[PDB]
Write a protein that binds this DNA or RNA. Structure first.
Ligand SMILES: [Mg+2]
Lengths: 49, 49, 49, 87, 83
DNA sequence: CGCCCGCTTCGGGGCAACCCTGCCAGTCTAATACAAATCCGGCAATGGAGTCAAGACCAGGTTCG
């Protein structure tokens, strides 16, 4: 009930982000603090990706 | 208020607070090519594995 | 899979060492095996995280 | 959002167009030109038998016989074993 | 230079790589642009040959282009200028 | 003489974390009259698009006297 993965599934309606949760296919959330970590590395191209 | 005594979502409420466009969909988005599972200890691996 | 790094997140990401990149290898079962030395940087014990 | 792009069938459509180009180009020029004008591949509107007979300087009956012979040709397994998995 | 024989991702040693460049960001863009050149060589191989130059060192069996880029860097076979 | 400036008090707005997990909320005069608009059901002008039968015929492999 926990293992999950996604290559390309559905997408949201108003905005066009991928969906959420294992009930749908859904992708993980790359929130604010992880963007702060990727900025703090100096790694910028992965953030653009 | 609409039905069920819930206040309607006006135009400024698409931006304000935590549920706005800024702190929810602009800075941190759901991504594709992702996964999630539980972890266990792997003491036979090398450090970079 | 061989020679293709992946990023391993742990939520919440407190600081810069909350995202590190490993080399994967195929492991039976359904649990993400982890090295027992990056647990201090990740701040992750194995109580179901 | 079901009206979005499934993003594997689009690239499969592109590879299908290239495979159909290879299969149609394995034949001659008159056959492939008549087929593409008949089913509307180079343009949106499919040209009719009278239109292809006009552009080929013939009657429509020769165009129809060419169409029947080419459709009898294309159902060969040598020209079908690559296109069978595309439906 | 008395380490054990490395393996996998870290087969070119990073401290032997970082004596060729100034800092690690330059090394990142160095290896990435070399890898883009190598993959553009492989894809335009079936057509006529262009100015893109192939893998200088001998490749593996089925190696990623980025590892070929890193080994070409470590073998001191390229040259680069910053911006 | 009532008029007006320093203090005090009162109130309004903002924020208060981060990973999964989630799947649909209510009600009371009621009719006629008519007219315009839209549709739909069914032949009737085709007429063009395709189908078929036959044949005229150009000329290179294929088999006899
Ligand atoms: Mg824990």
């Amino acid at each position: 009930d926990k293992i999950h993965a996604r290559s390309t599934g559905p997408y949201s309606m108003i905005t066009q982000q991928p969906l959420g949760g294992k009930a749908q296919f859904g992708g993980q959330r790359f929130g604010e603090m992880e963007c702060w970590a990727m900025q703090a590395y100096g790694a910028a191209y992965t953030l653009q990706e | 208020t609409g039905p069920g005594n819930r206040p309607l979502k006006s135009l400024s409420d698409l931006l304000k607070g935590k549920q706005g466009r800024f702190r929810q969909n602009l800075l941190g988005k759901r991504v594709d090519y992702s996964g999630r599972s539980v972890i266990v200890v792997g003491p036979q691996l090398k450090l970079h594995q | 899979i061989a020679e293709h790094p992946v990023l391993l997140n742990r939520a919440p990401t407190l600081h810069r060492l909350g995202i590190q990149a490993f080399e994967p290898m195929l492991v039976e079962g359904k649990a993400i095996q982890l090295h027992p030395l990056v647990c201090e940087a990740f701040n992750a014990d194995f109580d179901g995280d | 959002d079901s009206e979005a792009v499934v993003a594997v069938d689009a690239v499969s459509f592109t590879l299908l167009q290239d495979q159909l180009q290879s299969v149609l180009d394995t034949l001659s020029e008159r056959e492939a030109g008549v087929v593409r004008l008949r089913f509307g591949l180079t343009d949106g509107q499919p040209r009719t038998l009278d239109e292809i007979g006009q552009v080929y300087g013939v009657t429509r009956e020769r165009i129809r016989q060419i169409e029947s012979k080419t459709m009898s040709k294309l159902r060969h397994p040598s020209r079908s074993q690559v296109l069978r998995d595309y439906l | 230079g008395g380490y054990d024989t490395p393996l996998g991702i870290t087969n070119p040693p990073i401290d032997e790589l970082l004596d060729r460049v100034s800092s690690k960001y330059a090394l990142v863009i160095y290896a990435a642009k070399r890898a883009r050149q190598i993959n553009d060589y492989y894809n335009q191989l079936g057509e006529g040959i262009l100015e893109y130059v192939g893998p200088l060192v001998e490749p593996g069996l089925q190696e990623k282009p980025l590892s070929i880029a890193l080994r070409e860097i470590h073998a001191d076979l390229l040259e680069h200028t910053e911006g």
